[model samples]
Every structure is written in C-alpha cells, then in structure tokens.
Target chain A: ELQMTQSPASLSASVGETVTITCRASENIYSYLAWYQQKQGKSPQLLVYNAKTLAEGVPSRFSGSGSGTQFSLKINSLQPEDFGSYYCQHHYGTPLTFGAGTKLELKRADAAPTVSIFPPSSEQLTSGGASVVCFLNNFYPKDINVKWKIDGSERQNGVLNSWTDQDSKDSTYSMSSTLTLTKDEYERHNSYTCEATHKTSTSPIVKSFNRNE
Target chain B: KLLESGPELVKPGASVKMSCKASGYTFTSYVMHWVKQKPGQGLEWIGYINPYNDGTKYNEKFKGKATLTSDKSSSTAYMELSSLTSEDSAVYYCVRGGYRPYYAMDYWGQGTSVTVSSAKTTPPSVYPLAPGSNSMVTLGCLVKGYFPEPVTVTWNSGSLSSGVHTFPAVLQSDLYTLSSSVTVPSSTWPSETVTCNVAHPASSTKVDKKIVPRDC
Candidate 1:
C-alpha cells in the first residue's frame, strides 16, 4: 500500500486553542481513512474513520474531514487533556502504514514565571548527607533517558524512574532522579544536574539544583 | 451488491469449517477472502487466499500470525487460528477477492460463528497494559453467533475465577443473524493459560490460546 505522511513533527497549543493535523495519502484512497490515539503504552483507540465518521465513543470535539488523497483531524477548543501525540493510519491498502506522530505541548504565551533551574536536575539519590531531586513532569512514551552528574565531576550511579497514567486523553509520563552528596559537599554549595533525553528529538532538557540547603 | 450473502452462526475456536460453495462463476479463477465482524464495529480484514493460483496474503498486523489455507479439492477455504483469544473471537466470514488488486471488500459470506472454546494453544493475540508491564497480562474472550440461543462465552485460567468481563449488546442482522463480543481480563495474563469456553444448545467446546507481548 501507499505511505501516509503527517506534517509538523510537533505542535504547541494552549487550552481552548484550535489545532489541526494534515495527512496526505500517496494515492487516492477515496474515504478509506482512519485515525488512532495511542497513549504512552496502551492499545490504540480508533478516533475517526471513512475520513469523517466518528468512532463509537470518541468525543464530538474531535472531528475529521477531507476526502480523496488528503484528510485532517481537527480538535476544536483544545483542552489541557489533549496535550500529547496524535497519529493517522490508512486502511485503504495493504501493509497498513502509520504517520510519524505529532507531539503536542502546553504553551503559555503570557503566564507568570515559575521556578527555573539551569545545568539540569537529578532525582536519583545515593546514601549520603544530602540529596537533590529533579522532576521531568508531563512527558511521555517512557523512552526517555534520565541521568545525574555531580558538579564538574564524571557521572555517578543514580536511579531513574518514571510512571504513566493512560486514563487521560494524553498519556503523560513523570520521571525523577536523585543525586547524593557528602556532608562537606552539601555544605560547600555542591551543584548537581539532571538531564532528560528522548530519541525522537534533539537536545535534552536539563534542570540544575544545589544539594546545599 | 454481491458482497452480502450466506449463513450466520458462531463456532467455538476449534475451526468451525464452512464452504463458500460458489457456483455462478468460475470459482478457481477468483480469490476468496476472510474477514471478521463484531456487529456495529469496524471490519478487520484477516487475510485472503487465491484458489486459482494458491496465493495468500495476510494483514501485516497478522502476518506469519494467522493461518490462511485452502482446499481446492473441495473448492473450500479454511481459517484455523491455533490460539484463540477474545481478540480472535469474532464473526469470521468469506468473501470473493476482487479481480482488481487493492479494491475494497466486494463479496461477503454469511458469517459463520466462532466462539473460542477449550483448545490446546492459547490465543495468539496479546493485550499488554504498559511497557515492561507485559509480565502482568490479560486475556479476552469473545463470542459471535446467531441468537435466541443465548450463547455464553466464559474465560477460565485452569480454574474459574471471576475477573472483569464485558459483553457487547446483541445485534440483529438481516435473515435473523446476530453477533456480539465479550472480554475477560486475567491478572495472571502472561503467566497462565486462558481458555474461552462457548456453550450452545447443540454443543460446547473450549478454545485455548497463550499470549506474550514482545518489544516492538
């Protein structure tokens, strides 16, 4: 069968904002189109089919349109719950192909500044005087790599843990790592950084915090 | 228009063999296809077999997966699922493969009912909740057949243990045809063998299947 291509590798939308994704078929498929939403680690839930008909239990806010070789899934008044990945599949031919998904993130154009840290943060803890914790919240797929490094020193052993809640529209993942420091290191303003990495994207996000309280 | 015709019945997973028995045209020249239906649900194209050339193609989602063999001697097609899970428990029917490749399903058989019953192998379908969580799996049991007989599909992990069970509302098709699906969750999914037992007025049997989720 022909391949399906989805545009925009990622998207940023605010709650109540409108979002649209376009999928183009290699050839004419008439109306033989379908859409599925696969939260982090769950089976895909069919959302749209025949290019327009909504699957049995899908919400009305999720709608699809267009026919022939092109189709799109439109979400009206996007909600905080809708911030995740979306994929499209075409059943019009053989070897059913899926579009590379579009990752959706929350965008606050004019919000108050929250606490910001640099150099990264760690959630893994070692038995020592003090420990620093870093959290990667609202991430997904569980395919992320999290690690910790002591100030200006080579990385040491640390634990990385994550959990996903599939009940929501977007399968959200939370990860944390802790770093341990000695009493002297804790009192000397020792710095530790935690880094979260994903294979699908370039550049990792880091959060830095000091073990000294 | 030729896509809709045939009998409507449910069979436990031990292969309820049936013949499409086409007579109007040259059967050998055309290919026969099989599909699954869950009443009001979407159509899952299982696979297709060519009687003329003995060519076969399966859904990638089911490649090497489902067995699609035929017997030209009887001009009949057979779909034998070694392991029958609730996911495999759907109304299976035969169709005339379109002469033009890649065309939509053109001809459909009056679906024959297949209720997975006691069998040796666990159903080949897998239901995993999360990554690395495959150790804790669940099995689904589905039954689709004609009604007024009130077919019952149950799941047992060697012993009858009550878990979560969901049944589809009965649907009525033309010519008194009926269909529905039932799902059973097994906490010991990956470790234990689960069987789908179908009870009918005429007979009863259990179709067994095992499931193991692999990293994709």
Candidate 2:
C-alpha cells in the first residue's frame, strides 16, 4: 500500500520567503510522485510530476526533489498567490492516494490575538451553574492554544472550545472557549484565567475574570 | 487558511453536520463546494453552497444525502449529511469557487473526516524501513492497513519518543496507513540500539526491530 504522509500539516512564510513541504510514502514509489498546488477555491493543479519534473506552465520558483519514499517540493520565493494548499500524490498504484496536504499560509508577523475573558451569564447563574467564555480575536497563522485556570492551576473539566473562525475581510482568526463552573465554585474561586498562546506571541496572552469583575 | 470542522467519528445511521470556515478571501465572492473521498476511492462531488445568498446545488447522486448552507456573519459554510452508512464514511472537503471560472475551486480546506466506522479493530501491519545514509542515520517505520485509528508508534523503548516524527494516518481501501521516522546521529548511531514499538488497540503486540548499522 502506498500511503503518503505530509509534514508541517500547515506552514507560514513571508511573501519573499522560501519554504519546503515534505512528503514520505509508506513504500518506495520511486519517481512516481507528483506535486499539486490547490489555490484556495481552485482545483488542484499539477506542479511537478515524475518526482522532479516540473509541470508545464508551472513557475520556475517551484522545484521538486527526492526519490524512493521521500519527496519534497520547495517554493523558492513564496508569493501572495502561493498562499494555498499543496498536495503530493503518487500514481504508482491503484486507489490513487494523496497526502494529507500542506497549507502554505502568509505569515502575519505582527498579528497576535487579543485575549479577553468574559464573566458567566445570568441565565447560567440562575440555572445553578456559570460558564465563562474566553475569546481570542484577530490572530494569524491559525494555531493557538487556550487554557482555563482557576486559582492558578489547570482545570480541564467542563471546558469546551469552538473551532477557530476566520474573518473574510481581514483573514484573521477568532476563537472562543467556554469553561463551566458551578455557582458555588465561581463564588469561591478568586481568579479565573484564560491563557492564549499563538505563533505571533512570545508568551501566552493572559486575561483574568473574577466574580464581580 | 480555510479550516473544516465537525465530528470526525460518527456512527452509521446518524446524521452529521460539518462546517468550513473561510479566511484570506471574500467569502461572498466565491461559491463553496463539498467533495467526498471514501477510503481508497476517488473524489466525488457532493454539493456547493453560495455564501452570498445560500443557494445550493448538488450532484444528482448526492441529492437527499447532503444539505449545504452558509453563514455570512462568520464567513462559514456548512454541509449536513443524513442517512449515514459505511459507504458514507470519508473525508469531505469544502472548496471555494470564485465568481469567474478561473477562480473556480481555487481554495480548499483540510478535509474533515466523517468516519462512519464500526471497525472491529484491525491491527497495523508494521515494518521497519532500511536505515538511511551513513552521514545522517535515519530510521523509518511503516504502519499500514489499520482500522479505527488512534495508533501510537514509539521508538528506542520510548526513550526517543519526543524526536520521532509520526505522520497522520491516510485512509485507503477501508484501512488506514501511517509512517514514522527518527534520525539518530552518526556519532552514536552504531553504538545505539534502536527499536520501533507500535501500540494498537486491536492487539498489544510490540514490534521491536533492532537496528544494526550497516552501509547500504
């Protein structure tokens, strides 16, 4: 079976930066590997085939290398149009397989998520439990970690995180995480912290919530 | 980046709904389409949703099986599948189709899997690939044809767990395939005894293939 594994699942680079996406196959497919560029909303277009051959009309900035089970596609100078998804596929066998895909994203070096924690809702309080919401807004490069802390320790129970949503106009990402607590727990807890870690942040952005605040 | 989100493991006969959130472009300027790929199968067009007005069109075969909608406020598009079956188990993709034909299907999301499994647990067929060049010794393990995912591959009796690069499973023909690699420095590779251990739910078999450094 020829199964392909792609690396970095997602990558971010500047417009003039160079980046390489790697693909490894389960078995040696020799030179049967091909690389495709799927620009957002567009069908996958071949960039390289036969391991190292560049497809017709593909720009010179793209190159393919490696053989046997390992292959890589390098983008010499990423352009705005190059920000999309890349896939490596092999034609060595039936049931043609494609890699999980590597997303080429435009790096927003200065875009860091603004972190905020909101107090529990009145409805929830009346229902005998309260839930605090942590919001991370306007982040770039997508990857982020959000954690809820009560009284300085990690609390994993009753935590629900929403998938990151993107702003169509600005391409920035936003996400929310909710942590539920009983009314008594909220009243007794001195501090509730929402910590956000992003690629653009040197350290986690922390916001705190309190019973009255 | 366009991200697709939803339930990954849904049982057969249950309805599943997925969403694809669009970023980096005008959501209303493009039409969103969904495609399905069952294990070891070719891609099939499911349907498309117009984010501007929520108009939808589906392939005849997908009719009644899929429903497409969009949320302009969030720049997100959605698809719901009903009457699920094993055949419906596959990765679904949402594509952005621009207004003009040239912009058609230009963008894609990392497909979301709706595994309608009830896998009885299939063990991975594991094998150790030959070691790499002498200058930089690297070892790889191929874990193929497993079912009901969530398998783990450890190296060097778990001592080298942190550096091991294990890939995500790629589904093929009702089975899943994966591979992992770890690079051992040449200075200590010869003296080091490396082993790859795979943990699968189906069986507790530990495949420890000792590496003996030899020139290729």
Candidate 3:
C-alpha cells in the first residue's frame, strides 16, 4: 500500500487552457498507473489507462505520463466536459487502490452558480451505469463541487472534467460533472446525491436522487 | 459481505432480529456496530459486538430493543430488535471494519428495514493513530480504548521487525487512553505495509498504517 500524497488539492482553469495535477507515490510506481475521472456522484471512469495510454475515444487533449513515482494527468485545450475531479490509481497489481483526488474547477466568473442535473429517465438507475450530468450553469468564480454521495458516502469513481462555455454576451460560465452509477450500488437501492458549493453564495446548490423510483 | 433484512415491512409492535455476515477478512478481526435510520430521519447509533468473545454494549435507548451478537464460526453479527412498534419501522445498517480506539467504519452493509420501525448511541473513541518516522528511519503506530473504566490500548500489527520502544497505555477512568510507539523500517513499506489495530475486543481487523517513506 503506497501512500499517495497529492499536491494542490484542486485547481481552476478556463476553457481552452491547460492544467496538470501531480501525485508523488511513496515508492516507484514506474508506469504502473491510470487516471480516472469522477463526475460528482458517480463511479470512476478510466481516462488514462495503463499508466499513460489515452483510453478509446477519450480525445487527444487528455494525456498521462510519469516515471519512477511522480505521475501526472494533463488536459490541454480544456473542454467544458473536462471540469470535474480526477484521481490516480495504480494498476501495478495490488489490492484496489487510488490516490486521493484533484478537482479541476472552472475559474471564477463574477456571478453565482446556476445548478441543474439531468436525471436518467430509465431503470438505468437499477441496472446501473446511470449517467447523471450536473450542470453548473451561468456562474462565475468558477470553482464548484459536483459531489456524489451514496448512502452518505462520497463516490469518486467516474469521468469528470470541466470545460468553459462562455456565453460571451453575458460572459457567464457553465461546467458539469457527469456521475455514473454502479449497478450493484443502485440495485441495492442506494440514494445518491450531488451537491455544488462555491464561494459568494448564501446557499449551496444541490440535486439529490435515488434509484428506487 | 453482509446479509440482513430488506425492508422487513413488518407490522408495528412485533419482534425482529437483524444479521450481518462478513467474509473476506477475519470476522472477529474487528468489532461490528449497528446503525438505525427512519425513512425521513438521520442515523442513530445502536451499539457494537465482539464476535470472538460474544460481548455486547447497548445504548439506553436501544437497550432492550436491541441485542448485539456475533458467531465467529459463521462470521456473522446479529442485532435483534423486539417489541417493535410503528416507531421501529426504519432501516438498520451493520457497520463492519475498523475497531475500537481508532479508524472504524470503512464500509457498511445495505440498510435493512422494518415498517413500524423506530430507532439508537454512538461511541466516544478514536484510534486516530499515525505512521511517523522514528530514530533513523522506522515507522510507528499509536493506540486508545474507553470502556469508561479507563481504556487499555495495544499495538497489534506490523512484522517481526517492528518493536515497541514504548508512551505506553496509562489509565485514568478519564474516558480516553493513548498508545505506545511501535515501529518498523521505512524500507519495508515498498514490499509491505503496517496496521494500527487497537482493540475493545480492544482490537482486531488490521489497517496498513504505512505512511510515505521519507527515503524509499
């Protein structure tokens, strides 16, 4: 069990900009690595699998590479879809493990977050693999949390990224964290929730959901 | 990992029992705690069980309504709630993992429920042990316990290379306790890790308390 100490708990960026988060493994991780994206309230999805190969259809903008133990996940030409949390897991073949997490947030825009989440319309909730997209629309001070919790437990296993979509006319911003649910979790009738919190708001924005229909 | 009633949907004023079967780890390696939650309510801590010894602790509220039991041979934990009323018609959850003194509740079973359900005590203890470096380059784990009568703590993981240079567990009936420093070399973390398993059973279940080695 290698203790993974990460840096800069989180980072902020704008669409089309690039940013990188780093993880220092207690030991040499070599190339035994993978990067996962977790939308608020979802299971993790593979972004950079096997240390550095970009997964199928993941787009060329996201990349991963590291040696010894210092690994990194880099996103260039940031897409609004890229604003969420990213975590690193070692595929070096030990018991399931993961680095803490890094939240890639939208840079501050000067307004409040307009929050909304699209609910899955089918029994996808029970069968699992439910994709719930949380949209933080028209907010400035782009930092936000698309937190996913199941039975009050935070789930950080899914694909998440925030890309800026500027409404140039109003100059507001929108970001999203698409959380995916695991079948067993929803099948067990777990209640999942995602909340968005930011600075400058009197109240936190939120959307809570369950699979029990 | 656990099997308990699923929305038992029972009538009010009935008697019921809940069970939790844990595998994949030593069942008696740690203690089990129970939680109660009504449909529009928060969680209530019922109590805990020590399967290896069949010991139980109950809260004043859950006292008679709850019975915590453990069958080490079958790797199961049982919590029976009798004389249920509409008030008992909520969910019950079995908490497995961690032990008294620190680092408990790493995972929980799906909630079991009844219809007439009512509700539950949380314990006041923590095994917030840490892995720090000793003299040249050794790893260390701390310890705690509180049965009220003063907790007796112990360090129970790591390998043969580990040693207790010894804060030692001091008693005071003051509601809390501490642990002695146990250590291993920093190099061991590369091939292995250690745990800070304290007990109340006073300890069981093992956690790898290995930290980032200063010099790997």
Candidate 4:
C-alpha cells in the first residue's frame, strides 16, 4: 500500500521565504511519487515527480527530495505569486492514494489532526518485517511533538528531522512518526504507539499499530 | 469546508444518488464542482454548481451522466449520477472552487470510490474493498437479484457484538438489485460466521452466504 502520511496543514511566509513540505509512504516507495500546486481557477501546477525531479520551466527555487520513503518537496521562497495549496499523489499498486491536501497560506489558528494509520505492505510482512506509519492531518505552526513507543519503552530520535515551516502569519503543517519492527517483533504481535504533542493541546494525542498498527 | 461521497458501488445500468455536505462557511458564498476519478485513473471534471442560485452547467461528456444540485438550507451541494456503467465506476469528489476568478478545486471532500463491478463473474455481494482498522474490519456485500425478485440484504455477524449500516439499495437497469456493507471486530474468529441474508419477494430462497474474515 502507498500513502501520503502527513502534509503541512497550513503555511505562512513573506514573499521571499523558503518552506518545505513532507509526505511519507506506507513502505519504501522507491521513487514513484509526485507533487502539485493548486493555483487560481485552473488546473493545478505540476511541481515534481519520480521522487525529486522538477518540472520543465518551473523556477529553480522549487525542489524535491527523498530518503526515498519520506518523499518531500520544498519551495525556495514564498513568492507573492505562489500563496496557495498543494496535494501529494503516490502512483503505485492498485488503489492510487493521496495525502490530505496541505494549505499554504498566511494564518494564525489551526485544527486538530484526524489520525489515520496504514499497515505495511503484505509483501513486506510476509518476507520478514514491516513499518507502520501514523498519518496526522490538518495541524499547524510546524512544531509538532511526535513520540514513538515500542511495547513500553519511549523512543526519542526515532525519526530525526527538523524545521521546514516558514513564518507567514499562522499556518498549519502535517508530519508523521514511525517505528520499524523486525520479523520477530511482528511474530510476537508487538504493538507500536505514537503520540502527537502539540503546543496548543491540553494533552498528548495517542494512537497505536500492530499486525504493529 | 470538507465534502464526502463514496463506495457508491452501483450496478451497471443502475443509478445512485449521492451529495456532498459542506460546512463552516456560507453555502451561498462559493461555487461547488463534482469530479470523477476511477481506480488508478486521472481526474474527470464533471462540472459545477452555482450555489447562490442552485443553477448548474456541465461538460459535454458528463452531460446526462451526472445530475448536479444544491440545498442552500443545508449548506450542502448534491450530485447524482444516472445511467451508471463501468465507465462511471470511480470515486466522485464534491469540491469548492478556490480562485475568486477561476477554480482549482482548492477545497474538496476526500474522493469516494464508486465501482461499476456488479453481478457478473460472481454472486451479488461484497468483499473487503479496503483494509479498515486493526480492531475492526469492514466488508462489502452485494445483494443483486433478477427483475420482479426485489431483494434487500440484511447482515449478521459472529459472537462479538458488531455493527451493520447498509446503503439504500439501488435498482439496477434490470431488477430489485442492491449492495451494502457491515463492519465487525477483526479478531472475532476468521472461521466464525458472517452472512448477508438476501430476501426477495418472488423467491423465499433466503440466499444466506458467509463472509469469512481472513488475517491477510
């Protein structure tokens, strides 16, 4: 299965600021991924595809990257002409899936995430092990606390990535926390847990995985 | 505001009615559009609605294939597809136009899957269209029957308490055919019984079939 696990809920920036948006697949997607920018009253702009290649004629300020599962696209600057939204589409297997659309705008307030989880590919689990991803949608400020726990031990530095949101009033961001389990762990049915701690939250939000989420 | 439509599993030649409900904004403030996306396919612009006046305009292709409407009172926009066919089998998205001058589908209800795969190589029923959650599972069951046979399906599950919410059955181009679904606990014994009881007026042949949940 392929998925756009997390997307920037919203973003804010001056006319000349760089911002990065991220999306993770359910498994190693190799390089089969694409991104787009939805502009005013027209077909959305094609930004990048096959992982990180830029579209022809697009500004050099636009770029793409990958670990390859964590496929991401970043805009060099928030040009006045580029304030809008974006969607991530992963073309793979049967049910072609998409990341929840992320909004790029100048804002202040944000919303809570509607958490969804995707289990590992059947091939992976059957072969040896699998990685479970928790998708957090519609959140903002770009500063999110994602913690992972295996069985009972808390994990930090589980996924070490940092700041990508730009300052543009108030904007939202989407991101994910992941934990990898070996064949034995899965054989034991060890469950994995993820907690999203937001600055505006009264308590941490928690979700789990097994078969790990 | 977000809109949703889905799993409208229509029979070939049968019609189904569905609409996207919008919220958190004045329905009259923005125009809404309906688009189609088949499994592993590109997007099709079905057309749009001017919520303010409840008037519509469509592309020549979606003409007669889709009927669009809106209820200002409900702050919702509706799109009903007729003359259903395999070509019509795809997720339909209800979207809000973004550019004040033009529209780029900036706001959308997540796409809903509409399959045209009805009675053919199999019985009238469903299989898991998707792997839902870990603790719970969702199964699709098609309740197809011949004309004058008017049949509606009801669901029954294992010992663990479960839930069943069947969609209003659609009359295909041929008979009292219907399709529906039910969700049950994933660990509730794969070998345990799950049935879609098919009852018809013409034949009391209570077509009771078992839906065996697997660990895959």
Model 2 lDDT per residue over B76-120, tens place: 888999988877878788866544522334455778878876554
lDDT of candidate 4 over B1-216, digit per residue (tens): 565754555676788888788998787877787767653334556777888887777766678888888878877777888877767766677767544532234455766666665543333432222232468555544443344424666766333223443433433333333344455676763555667676665444556666543354
lDDT of 3 by residue, B53-159 (tens): 87776555778888887777788788888877656766687866344433224456766755442211112243222221122233333222243222333444423
DockQ of candidate 3 compared with the true complex: 0.01
- Better model by TM-score: candidate 3 vs candidate 4: 4
lDDT of 1 by residue, B40-156 (tens): 333456677777787888877776546766667756667656544455555666766445533333344556555443322222111211112122233333232233244545455
| Cα lDDT tens digits for candidate 2, A1-213 | 456888978786877888989999998888877777766444466678777887568899999999998899998977778887788766543324667877676665458975555565443457576666665666776888988899879999877555433344566666656576679988898788888888786798887855554
Ranking by DockQ: 1, 4, 2, 3
Residue A18, model 3: lDDT of 84
| Candidate number with the higher lDDT (3 or 4) | 4
Better of 1 and 4 by lDDT: 4
lDDT of 3 by residue, A135-164 (tens): 556667645666777677788876353445
The parts of candidate 4 lying over 4 Å away from their true place are A1-213, B99-103, B120-216
* Segments in model 1 whose C-alpha atoms lie over 4 Å from true places: A14-16, A37-45, A53-62, A78-85, A103-147, A150-173, A178-213, B1-56, B59-216
Best by TM-score: 2
Against the true structure, what is every candidate's RMSD? 17.3, 22.2, 27.5, 18.1
Q: To one decimal, what is the Cα RMSD in angstroms of model 3 from the true structure?
A: 27.5
Q: Model 2 captures what fraction of native contacts?
A: 0.00
Write candidate 1's Cα lDDT for A12-119 as tens digits.
677898999999989887887777664442223567777788867788999999988889999999876676667776656564456666766665322111111221
> Which segments of model 3 are wrong by more than 4 Å?
A110-213, B1-216
| Displacement of the residue B208 alpha carbon in candidate 4, Å | 21
Candidate 4, residues A4-111, lDDT tens digits: the string is 675666556656778888988887767767677765333455577666777667788888888567877888866777777677765433233567767676645767
Q: Model 1 lDDT vs. the true structure?
A: 0.52
